[PDB]
RNA sequence: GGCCUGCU
RNA sequence: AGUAGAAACAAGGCC
């Protein structure tokens, strides 16, 4: 089971403010 | 969207989701200092609910006292302590009439108990104020000091071993011309005149209450001395005997029996009513319960209960309210000061509040001191006209049950009638009538009668609604009791006794909550997983496979590597967790017995190991090396009471030797009044005699042991 | 008459008789005759026992005095005058070893050669009646009975007097002499007529002296003595006193029922003042994380090494400078503290091995920030008495503060579903019973719906921070440690990660009571500029340390990075209840389980699957401009978990008081909504009690706002 | 024999003699419980705060000679510092695990006998058979039940008397058994313990646990047999139910 | 500086 | 400064 919140907005925010990417990874 | 948890009650009835509104996950409020700011407030308020009472001056303690009983009837809804003796006796007499023979049987049972009880029973108590050090000492230490002083000062009737004999000693002490004690500071002899000792025997020690849920303002809780403990014990025994025979008294039983009684009452009232009759359940609550139960009413009740009983029993029961009516409430630690400019702080003992100037305090503490000063005597305040905290909950519940009974439609003489269940400080009353004005009249009658008996209903925490939904001491009821799980939440963590004890206690708590508070299977499994996680994180006993680095991980890993059947190690030694919803009632070590290695099994439960403490909520435990006991704080060493540790060492040595002589001393408390040496010598002589008669002991050993006993007796007699 | 008993007998006999009387509880002062009788019986039995020593075979030497031997072999073993416990112990021991039948009552002596007991008594009544009472008392008597009356009459069973007649004559002479002395005194008749009541014991507890003088002052006002009060109560009979006083009482004392209607309740009166500010021990919404993929679990690894490795991933460090001063502090001190922490991290990195814990140098910056030497010196009141500014410790009501908009946004963000897995629970015993399988399925659902919530991230952060602080303050009670914040999670693809929010620098932590304070300057990363909600960051000292280059849906954005430095404190009880923060999961999941089971009871089949997957029946949670917005069971679970987590984080007395006083009103409203016709005696008092708790706590203010919204939506 | 030698050595000193002579047998309980360390108000907090320290456990003096000063690595297992008010020395949990992995062995073959109730419980659970789970409303009525699976039909006082007679024949005191059933069970127990090497106290505690009958107030619905009430948490739920047949 | 205490 | 809320901590006792 994979949770899916209708308010997900998985594409709404351009980046997660708390857990960003910064690093080239 | 603004998430709003409280909006969930638009659909889920409040009772069902009531667990949401219990913030029992954060640290409870803790008193941050001295309880002398609340004790003075309690004294002032107790004297303010009874100010119209009749002042006087005790002629023995020499302190002012207030006597509100039979005072003017209250004229406003404000709290009133003016209990009427005639009304109290009417309530008790009607209670006896409705339940014939309750008081006679209760008195018989209590007479047996008081004739049978031993002095050792006073040890099974919490902190008590010992009058020989003016500090709080455990019950056993205070009792030992009191008995030592009594023996030193000529009182020795308590050596018989019965509690009533110790009470006789206590009473004979107050007549002693001048007591003396030998407290240390190399020790000094401090002599207390009659009045000083009497004031010290009646004094109550007050400390602030900690870890209180559901209140914004801290309270004050008091602990009684050691002279008043026995009389309170006997009175409480009588009150419990009476309450156990009352269907409407919920105090002397557990939670589930409270549920049963309350459900029975609701079924009896609501169902038996015809269609036309209405019903209304009052989920009320009494305000300032302690500050209005005048001990003189308890004396009236105790005298009415003990009618037609032997005079000695009547006196020994009545002595408790007589001592509580003259109690002095020791203030407390005393305030503390500071100097912002000079950058320093000072501590002033509460004793010098009577003499200290009022230029230091606030605008509120100054008023409190100004008002409490007249009552102070030698650093303690007279607190006659009320109680401090409980200590008579059973008898107060008897009074509440009497007032509830007083409306059985045989004493109401009217269409409306009421009954319910009473638990000290909390009641649920179920009114019936043929019309709404009938319910109004019934509620007014109940309120006025309670006011006469000296107990006030709180009008800011009581509502009346059609029968069905109601609440009672946090047992919500919606057409059948609903289990709120947030009250038992604090119990889930590791209790903190030791490893095996913690495992047993946690699994037992999970099982019990599954039984009572309707904890579901999946939630029980998640609680089990979280408890195991917390237990490992607290005892550093991780699974071993993990690369955790802790002070204990090295040899947990070593033991894991050594073992063959790794699925048998105790969770305390890094083994796997094998519990589930079906194994919660089986102690752990008994669970993994089949999976254990012979070597590990032998090492684990080895009686020779030096960790087991020979034993000490009922948690099912199995003796094991993981039953060690934690250390003590060792904070006494700095203080002047260093010598007490030597006393403990010597007492433990002597008691261990006695245990060696008498096998049953550990199991059942040893009775008898022969000195310890004489008992030991007599046992040795008889043992040698029987062994020589038929056994291993021969003539040489018999002669040696007999001569050793003879020289021991000679040393004793010196 | 005490002189007779004290003189005519030996000191040891009177001493042990005193011990016996004290044992039974009597007082020799009153029952002197009983004392004399006990002493006489003891002397009789002792004279019976003494001067008898058996030997190898069945015979005795019966010496007169002072003739001991190595072959003691006492012919008699006295049982009387040993105390009840010791007497019964010896009786049971001898009965067990011999195997005889234990006498029901305590005998006097024992015979070893013959292996039987002997009972001896002294009687003032007729001898035959006493002897037959003794015989019938001893059921199935295998024990010899002997009776010695003062007048000289003797009797026994079968007349088997197994004793030397010289001993009998000696005891007869002793009794005759005692009778002569008693007759000379004149108490002999009293002894003869007093034997009837000696066996029975009556308790003689009484009140006299000071106790009686206190009892005479502890009665209703109109009574003078305790005896008069007892006489009045005993003669009391009910005559309508209650019904007589009810009418006499004023009619203003009533319990008028005020009906509670849809219009009665009113919105709670939230306080007014400056907006409230953050008070949690770590940033919740504005918490950056410098992560590095690492195959480690939970506690594996050295926290310092993990922290430095995470720090060595972000390459945008700049020279720190203050961008939102503290308004009350020495902010340059905060800047130097951060500089020192960074230098110390470089130092530890340069070292060969990584110490488990690092103790910071005691510099002025940490000394001020951690409040060292701040406490006034303790002094006695004798000399610090005339000080001009000496007062009582400031104890005043907390400063009032109003509700801000940030707490609602934080609670919103603390309910969303993240894309990680913040909780990884160990295995459980293998399931066998079908209940275990159903529970496992439902638990998979729950732990999936709760492991991804951000409230669980806050739970884990709090647990780790409090555990680390407690362990460090219990060991290094005199050095400034450096405790980096760490948290580990599984990404959406299962890869493990470790995170680094910031650093903590514990101060001196000599905690004695479970309320003392250990100050720890908390340094935290963040990406949110403080110049947007300045009223919220009242107690921090934000600095600008670096400039990240994050990748978004647009690509590189290059936002600046900030460091929220602040001092703070936590006690030994807050640390414990923060370490125990995992019960929030239990609370929320128990509520959700209750709801699901309640629904599934009606429909005879499990309902969890469609509840969590079909997006079936939904609950009203939240409030949008369009009205109340429904939410699925997943969102209800997450919202309840977030509520519990915030209760744990923002705990305070105000919350407890408000929760209770508002549960009362909530139950009243629910009773109204069920058409139960509620009714209140004093609603205004309840409202005033509720409004007294809302003072300055952001969480309590937010809860009051929710309650006002619920009252608006309910009853309408 | 050594008992009297130790008594003589103890009374040789002044304070020990004074305590020995003044105190009577009745005051033994008070003297045993005489201690300055008060009970923990918050055991959980103290335990969580104590395991952080070194040597949070107290063990008998014999640890000094039974367990080395330090293990292989060199972590101290015990410290000569004495406890507050006893001769017990302070040790760390490393000591407990060191005992478990290296301590003297022993034959625990008698352990199942001493704790026979718990192993009988496991035996019942192991041989139990389950059935289908039914979702249906449960009328959880509250009544008093018996929680002891094998109660021997004896009151607490009567059970205590039986235990004292079985394990402490000499200390039985004035009490004499009356019911023939008591005598029969006493003989049955005495025959099977004619030679048992475990301490008398453990035997007494075991007999007390497996003879005294216990009753508790539970919300049971279906069952009430002591065997069924044992697993009440597994066959009774708010909405679900299960058929369970304990092994027997 | 040294000793002692982290509920006394 | 900071925690905290009707009173406290921000180390205490002794040589």
Author numbering:
A (entry chain X): 1 to 25
B (entry chain B): 1 to 185, 206 to 636, 655 to 756
C (entry chain A): 1 to 716
D (entry chain C): 1 to 248
Sentences from the paper on this structure:
Each vRNP complex packages one viral genome segment using viral nucleoprotein (NP) and viral RNA-dependent RNA polymerase (RdRp), a heterotrimeric protein, that consists of the polymerase acidic (PA), polymerase basic 1 (PB1), and PB2 subunits. In a process called “cap snatching”, the viral polymerase steals 10–15 nucleotides long capped RNA fragments from nascent capped host RNA, generated by the host RNA polymerase II (Pol II), to prime its own transcription using the PB2 cap-binding and PA endonuclease domains. Functional and structural studies confirmed that the viral polymerase selectively recognizes the serine 5 phosphorylated (pS5) CTD heptad repeat sequence YSPTpSPS, the signature for initiating Pol II involved in capping. Here, we present the structures of the CTD-bound polymerase of the 1918 pandemic influenza A virus.
Cryo-EM analysis of the complex generated a high-quality map to a global resolution of 3.22 Å comprising the polymerase core (PA-C, PB1, PB2-N domains), the PA endonuclease domain, 15 bases of the 5′ vRNA promoter, 8 bases from the 5′ end of the 3′ vRNA promoter, and continuous density for 25 amino acids of the CTD peptide. Though capped RNA was added to the complex, this was not observed either in the RdRp active site or in the PB2 cap-binding domain. The PB2-C domains were not observed in the consensus refinement. The global polymerase conformation is that of a transcriptase as characterized by the position of the endonuclease domain packing against the PB1 C-terminal helices (24–26). The CTD occupies an elongated binding site along the PA-C domain, where we observe 25 of the 28 residues from the peptide. The phosphorylated peptide buries a total surface area of 1,160 Å2 with the interaction mediated predominantly by the first (designated repeat a), third (designated repeat c), and the N-terminal half of the fourth heptad repeat (designated repeat d). The phosphorylated serine residues pS5a and pS5c of the peptide are highly ordered and are coordinated into binding sites formed by K635/R638 and K289/R454, respectively. E416 and E457 aid in the correct positioning of R454 to coordinate pS5c. Specifically, residues Y445, E449, and F612 interact with Y1a and D419 may contact Y1b. At the C-terminal end of the resolved part of the peptide L290 and Y313 contact Y1d, L527 may interact with P6c, and R551/R559 contact the peptide as it leaves the surface of the PA-C over the top of the PA 550-loop.
